[PDB]
Design a protein around this ligand. Structure first.
Ligand code: NA
Length: 195
């Protein structure tokens, strides 16, 4: 019960840009962690077909970044429609999380949520409305723990979906281990008794 409801649905998307009125999802990856950030299951990792005209009119930033990562070429070759991709993700979360109870998780994952609410609404219906925004914790770390903030892991920032999920989890793990308060565990309790 509670353990299942405390899972997290980590997602990262690539889009043709930041304009919700025109831009589209071109890559999406998803995995599930338990409440303690251990990966329980790897979900689909999909490159979604979108029209040539849209890719050709992307911002210079997106042309450069999705170009050099290979993503633009892979979008043009993709046979995966948005609808089929959404189904794969929805089927996956239906196997992994109780309906309505688990949040999206990632860095500034509200941006992903904005695109998913519009373009994958049935996927989003399986999830809670709250999010685990790693960048909220980042912004609190920078303010409240400036010394510790300097030791956060460096990110490769490849703008590819699955690799970026792993970096997001690693960042949150860093904050848990370095700016949240310490707690008892099985090993410390056995030592306390032994002393
Ligand atoms: Na992202």
């Amino acid at each position: 019960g509670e353990s299942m409801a405390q899972r997290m649905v980590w997602v990262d998307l690539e889009m043709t840009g930041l304009d919700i009125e025109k831009d589209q999802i071109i890559e999406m990856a998803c995995l599930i962690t338990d409440s303690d950030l251990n990966i329980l299951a790897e979900g689909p990792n999909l490159i979604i077909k979108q029209p040539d005209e849209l890719l050709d009119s992307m911002s210079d930033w997106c042309k450069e970044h999705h170009g050099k990562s290979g993503l633009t070429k892979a979008v043009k070759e993709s046979t995966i429609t948005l609808q089929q991709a959404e189904y794969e993700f929805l089927s996956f979360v239906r196997q992994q999380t109780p309906p309505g109870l688990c949040p999206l998780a990632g860095n500034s994952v509200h941006e992903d949520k904005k695109f998913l609410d519009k373009y994958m609404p049935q996927f989003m219906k399986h999830l809670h409305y709250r999010i685990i925004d790693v960048s909220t914790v980042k912004e609190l770390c920078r303010r409240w723990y400036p010394e510790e903030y300097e030791f956060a892991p460096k990110k490769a920032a490849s703008h590819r979906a699955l690799d970026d999920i792993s970096e997001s989890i690693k960042e949150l793990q860093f904050y848990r281990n370095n700016i949240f308060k310490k707690k008892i565990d099985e090993k410390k309790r056995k030592i306390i008794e032994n002393g």
